[PDB]
Design a protein around this ligand. Structure first.
Ligand SMILES: *C(=O)[C@@H](NC(=O)/C(=N\OC)c1csc(N)n1)[C@@H]1N=C(C(=O)O)C(=C)CS1
Length: 244
């Protein structure tokens, strides 16, 4: 309570500074959006969503009966960039591992025409998926701002997106990444590799009392960084604000 806003802002900036990155973290409490970090002007800039799009890919695929939550997506036997992708998995496992080939298969099942209609219907980011159904979230043309990502997280956390309640609950169950005291953190990461590289961690804290506090971390990744810096800055920021 007694910590100054000047102190909170300095502390959260220092987490991005110490990571040798440029970034923001947007926190929403009710309808109020607060922008913190060491590069505040990133808040209304467009970036590819990268693997954060898996949240909406999963919602679209489940709602349109392109998969079930127990369905096992078989590994095709081909070598992957990541050896942990060389296995058969559900959408939920794919969400935790960020197994791009599973979300590419799901996107192909949905198909371009339905995917473009659904992305337009949800009003996600710039809403433009272009002509390639299996990589539009990774290389463009789809883009989104950190403000738009925190607002998407707020919509999903409160079941406000235009999908069935059951569809939204199914995808939320796939996004639990941490429990701290009685808090649960739901989030999806992204890393647009191949300069400048974008890193994301977008989600919400569900506090003990039931309050949901959405957030979106957006930062420049560089060759040599650990992906876990996204988690570390996010957790330090939320702890600094007493959200966790
Ligand atoms: C999702 O963000 C995804 N990222 C990618 O597929 C890459 N680029 O995205 C636009 C990528 C990977 S290797 C390369 N040359 N380009 C997954 N993200 C992570 C993550 O940590 O968020 C992964 C562990 C797997 S790939």
């Amino acid at each position: 309570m007694h910590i100054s806003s000047q102190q909170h802002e300095k502390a959260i900036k220092s987490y991005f500074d110490e990571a040798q990155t440029q970034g923001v973290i947007i926190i929403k409490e009710g309808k109020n959006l607060s922008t913190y970090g060491n590069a505040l002007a990133r808040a209304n800039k467009e970036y590819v969503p990268a693997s954060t799009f898996d949240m909406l890919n999963a919602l679209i695929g489940l709602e349109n009966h392109k998969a079930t939550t127990n369905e096992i997506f078989k590994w095709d036997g081909k070598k992957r960039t990541y050896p942990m992708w060389e296995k058969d998995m559900t959408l939920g496992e794919a969400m935790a591992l960020s197994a791009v080939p599973v979300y590419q298969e799901l996107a192909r099942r949905t198909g371009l025409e339905l995917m473009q209609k659904e992305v337009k219907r949800v009003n996600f980011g710039n809403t433009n998926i272009g002509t390639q159904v299996d990589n539009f979230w990774l290389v463009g043309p789809l883009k989104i701002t950190p403000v738009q990502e925190v607002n998407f997280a707020d919509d999903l956390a409160h079941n406000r997106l235009p999908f069935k309640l059951e569809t939204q609950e199914e995808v939320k169950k796939m996004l639990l990444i941490k429990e701290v005291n009685g808090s649960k953190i739901y989030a999806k990461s992204g890393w647009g590799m191949g300069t400048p590289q974008v890193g994301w961690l977008t989600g919400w804290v569900e506090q003990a009392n039931g309050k949901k506090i959405p957030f979106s971390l957006n930062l420049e990744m560089k060759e040599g960084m650990s992906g876990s810096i996204r988690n570390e800055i996010t957790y330090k920021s939320l702890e600094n604000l007493g959200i966790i």
